A paper describes a structure:
Calcineurin is an essential virulence factor that is conserved across human fungal pathogens, including Cryptococcus neoformans, Aspergillus fumigatus, and Candida albicans. Calcineurin is a serine-threonine specific protein phosphatase that is a heterodimer consisting of a catalytic subunit, CnA, and a regulatory subunit, CnB, and is activated in the presence of calcium and calmodulin. FK506 acts on fungal cells by binding to FK506 binding protein 12 (FKBP12) and forming a complex that binds to and inhibits calcineurin by sterically blocking substrate access to the active site. FKBP12 is a member of a larger family of proteins called immunophilins that bind to immunosuppressive molecules and mediate their activity.
We now report high-resolution protein crystal structures of fungal FKBP12 and a human truncated calcineurin-FKBP12 bound to a natural FK506 analog, FK520 (ascomycin). FK520 (ascomycin) is a natural FK506 analog that is modified at the C-21 position with an ethyl group replacing the C-21 allyl group in FK506 (27). Due to inherent challenges in forming the full-length ternary complex for crystallography, we next generated a novel “mini-calcineurin” as an alternative approach to capture FK520 bound to human FKBP12 and calcineurin. The mini-calcineurin construct consists of the full-length CnB subunit fused C-terminally to the calcineurin B binding helix (BBH; A. fumigatus residues 335 to 370, Homo sapiens residues 337 to 372) of CnA, lacking the CnA catalytic domain present in previous structures. (C) Protein expression construct of full-length calcineurin subunits A and B and mini-calcineurin containing CnB and CnA BBH linked by 17 amino acids. The human mini-calcineurin RMSD value was 0.57 Å, indicative of a high degree of structural similarity and that the truncation of CnA did not significantly alter the overall binding structure of the complex. Each of these novel FK520-bound structures represents a key addition to the tools necessary for structure-guided design of both FK506/FK520 analogs that show increased fungal selectivity.
Residue numbers in the entry:
A (entry chain A): -50 to -19, 12 to 169
B (entry chain B): 1 to 107
Amino acid sequence: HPYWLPNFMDVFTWSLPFVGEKVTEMLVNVLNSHFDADEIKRLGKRFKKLDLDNSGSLSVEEFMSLPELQQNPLVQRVIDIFDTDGNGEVDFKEFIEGVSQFSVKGDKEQKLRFAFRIYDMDKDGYISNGELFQVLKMMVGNNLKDTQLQQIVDKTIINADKDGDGRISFEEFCAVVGGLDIHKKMVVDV
Amino acid sequence: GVQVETISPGDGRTFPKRGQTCVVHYTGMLEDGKKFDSSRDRNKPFKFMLGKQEVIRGWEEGVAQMSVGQRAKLTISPDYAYGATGHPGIIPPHATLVFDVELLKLE
Ligand SMILES: CC[C@@H]1/C=C(\C)C[C@H](C)C[C@H](OC)[C@H]2O[C@@](O)(C(=O)C(=O)N3CCCC[C@H]3C(=O)O[C@H](/C(C)=C/[C@@H]3CC[C@@H](O)[C@H](OC)C3)[C@H](C)[C@@H](O)CC1=O)[C@H](C)C[C@@H]2OC
Ligand SMILES: [Ca+2]
Ligand SMILES: [Ca+2]
Ligand SMILES: [Ca+2]
Ligand SMILES: [Ca+2]
């Protein structure tokens, strides 16, 4: 008998509260555009304190130096999304533009665009089956069987794939997610 | 908060500490007893590390009071569970939860 999520839930509605919680936790811990002069100046101080090797770019090793991020399964995705030019590390401009997506007085649509970018690994604008499984696997780990996780991934995409190309576009993702108001959870003080 | 009630006792000495990983089987029910989730139905035990903010506060405070082999009923108030918001599509707001948890192993 195939596995169903509680209340026959789709994997987006199911994992989004954890996504919004763990991304907010990461940034709040990193901090311990839409910014004004003082808010950018505050972020420049907290950036240089985590540079460690003074290379001018936050790397994966420096991000995992904080003990609060060691067991956060969404660290690498946030680093990958911040890495706009895709060089493996995070510059200060990428740091400012990455934190700006979570500032209050930010747009709702851009906060859903970040939530979409959590699952869209290759950043082509479409969530593929392998992408959705792999990102959910980082959060689920061993707590589900791969067969169970694969089954709910299949049903979610099949029900959400409106145009029938096997992938989930941002418009299809917004049709499943829109009523969740996940943007209200993605807020960090600067 | 969380009320721990023993169903079956385990070895009294080995209690999970911060940093350890608790391997459990659980069945989650609403206060009226209606089941909403069960790791036994999945044939996959649930695992989490204590002190790393991975579970609700009722599980953090409740499972810590448990020991290896013990099976207990955990009655959790909303403030220690999902509060006045609930969990979207599963847990209603202000919902008191009852968890039948058994601590299988620590690793
Ligand atoms: C990819 C998302 C990820 C899911 C898993 C890795 C699979 C895992 C088996 C969860 C079940 O998935 C089938 C399922 O189990 C429940 O049914 C349950 O019985 C419970 O309550 N559990 C169950 C575990 C014991 C404690 C308690 C609990 O803490 O769960 C946490 C939880 C939901 C925390 C929320 C997250 C956002 C935040 O706002 C809120 O703040 C109060 C707390 C889970 C483990 C997250 O750490 C990880 C995921 O979410 C709850 C109802 C929903 C939950 O599904 C999501
Ligand atoms: Ca560096
Ligand atoms: Ca970069
Ligand atoms: Ca993609
Ligand atoms: Ca599609």
